[PDB]
Each structure stands twice: as C-alpha cells, then as structure tokens.
Amino acid sequence: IVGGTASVRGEWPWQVTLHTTSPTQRHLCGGSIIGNQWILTAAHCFYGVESPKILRVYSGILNQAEIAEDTSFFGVQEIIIHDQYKMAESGYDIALLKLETTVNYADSQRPISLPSKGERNVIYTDCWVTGWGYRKLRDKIQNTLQKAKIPLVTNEECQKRYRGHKITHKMICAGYREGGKDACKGDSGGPLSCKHNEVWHLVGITSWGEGCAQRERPGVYTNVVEYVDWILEKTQA
Numbered sequence: 001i002v003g004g005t006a007s008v009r010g011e012w013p014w015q016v017t018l019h020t021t022s023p024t025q026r027h028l029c030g031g032s033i034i035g036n037q038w039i040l041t042a043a044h045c046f047y048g049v050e051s052p053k054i055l056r057v058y059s060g061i062l063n064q065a066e067i068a069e070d071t072s073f074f075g076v077q078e079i080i081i082h083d084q085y086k087m088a089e090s091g092y093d094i095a096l097l098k099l100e101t102t103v104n105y106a107d108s109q110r111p112i113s114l115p116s117k118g119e120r121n122v123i124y125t126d127c128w129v130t131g132w133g134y135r136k137l138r139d140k141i142q143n144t145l146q147k148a149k150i151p152l153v154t155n156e157e158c159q160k161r162y163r164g165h166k167i168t169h170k171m172i173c174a175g176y177r178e179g180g181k182d183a184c185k186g187d188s189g190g191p192l193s194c195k196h197n198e199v200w201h202l203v204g205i206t207s208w209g210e211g212c213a214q215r216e217r218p219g220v221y222t223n224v225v226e227y228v229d230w231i232l233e234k235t236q237a
C-alpha cells in the first residue's frame, strides 16, 4: 500500500495473508474471508501453483512477524479459478479458496459482506485498500498491515488512463489524479472495502495497475458485484 498508514488489530478482520511454501514459505497474496470455509482472492495469484497443498491461509494477523513455524494456519482443499480468466489485465481476475477446516468467527476473523446487485447505483464514498504490499514500486513486503482511503473513479475516467487496455464493466478503478495512494506489489487478492450504511462491503479485489500510485494511473480492481452469481454457483458446488 503506497501512501497509507499502519492498521490496528481488529480493524480489517476479513483480511487474510495467503502464503505459499514452494520453494520456501512467503506471503503470496491478500484475500478476504467471505464464508466459514471460503476465501475470495485474485486468480492471478496462482501462477505456477499446481496443487493446493503448498498453500497456507493465515487469519487474525496484523504483523507478518506473528507467523512462525508454531503459528496456526488453514490449509486449502481446493482452488477455484474463473474459467474465463487468462490474465489479470484482461479481467475475470477472481478465485475462491475452499479451506480444509472452518474459520471460527471472532473479532479477529470474520466475513465481509458481498455487495448487492441493487447497489450498482450506490456512490461509495468511504473505500479502503489494505495489505502487506510494497509502499513504493521498489520496496518490500511490510510487516504491519497497511491501509489507505482511496476514491473510486468512473470507468470512463479509468479507460482514458489506460488506452492500451480495455477497462471493462467487471472492473472498478480507484486512485487520485495526482497519484500518491494505491495498492502495490504484494497487495493483490486483498480487499477494496467500502463502508455504506454502517456495513462493510467487499466492492473490489486488488488486481493490477501500471506502476504504483503514479499520476494518472489508477489502481484496477475486480468488480465483485459482477461475480456474485459465480461465487454462489461455485460455493454451492
């Protein structure tokens, strides 16, 4: 997260850190708890991942330093990637992880609500991006979970900033014209969370951008409301 600040324990309890163990254990991507056995994340996180056995999901984490060999984690039973997905920049950048065991909800770990199709006209004014990603294009994975409040921009605006791409209706963009606050490397798969009528909604999944926090280059996110039917179908199995 560029231009953000350290979060406090318990303020983003749907946020998880997904680790891979191959070739060695490290943070791979963010994710969001959406059900007792279900993490929603980005499809692009699973490049080269041939088995769910190498994945570990850690919940209730503020600092990566909390994760040692003796720290509890959730195993992954199955990775479900959208069948139209090919790469992040062309969309369908969404995936589900079915956990091996169930998350017992607490103030440290609880699900975020999905957006409603009836809310497509809602102007979300209180949106936050979170994660352990770089704080500059060249930086490193953060110990402490970061947060930044970032304004949504219209898809029409976003398209003008990425004329070499197609910004689709299943994408949503966020950023300042002058830059300075954005997701960055290591934040992908995590949530863009918007508070509306005193409830947090999972509006976006951190997906891609050209550089981090650059002038006239908003961050691009998977537009979650455009996938609620897909999420339902896949979780009903």
Ligand SMILES: O=C(/C=C/c1cc(Cl)ccc1-n1cnnn1)N[C@@H](Cc1ccccc1)C(=O)Nc1ccc(-c2nnn[nH]2)cc1
Binding pocket: 026, 027, 028, 029, 044, 045, 046, 047, 133, 137, 140, 141, 182, 183, 184, 185, 186, 187, 188, 189, 206, 207, 208, 209, 210, 211, 212, 213, 218, 219, 220, 221
């Ligand atoms: O995490 C991201 C974020 C990309 C991104 C998203 C938005 Cl909304 C706006 C700008 C973005 N960036 C553009 N250039 N950098 N960020 N991307 C992942 C892509 C990816 C994930 C998994 C597998 C392959 C590729 C990444 O680089 N992740 C990442 C994770 C860890 C490290 C890392 N560094 N040191 N140790 N681990 C570096 C990069």
